[PDB]
Design a protein. Structure first.
Length: 87
């Protein structure tokens, strides 16, 4: 406890990392964090739009072997995080 607060903190942390990893070419730590989240949760964004942005600008941050269509079959990272904390 509190699981709700933990999940919220994790999502906020991911959001901040995602923003840095995409905006800055040299946000080394942020990119590492984001890549780990994405590989672990099989996602590539906080929502449908940011997922699309990431796939277009920094596709290497997405799970390996992805393309422009892949997000259609993926829950976003917020949804994946929620799942972990609502089981």
């Amino acid at each position: 406890v509190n699981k709700d607060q933990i999940a919220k903190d994790v999502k906020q942390f991911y959001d901040q990392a995602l923003q840095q990893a995409v905006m800055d070419d040299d946000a080394n730590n942020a990119k590492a964090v984001v890549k780990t989240f994405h590989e672990t949760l099989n996602c590539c964004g906080s929502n449908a739009l940011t997922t699309l942005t990431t796939t277009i600008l920094r596709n290497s941050l997405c799970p390996s072997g992805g393309n422009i269509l892949t997000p259609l079959l993926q829950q976003d990272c917020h949804q994946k995080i929620d799942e972990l904390f609502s089981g």
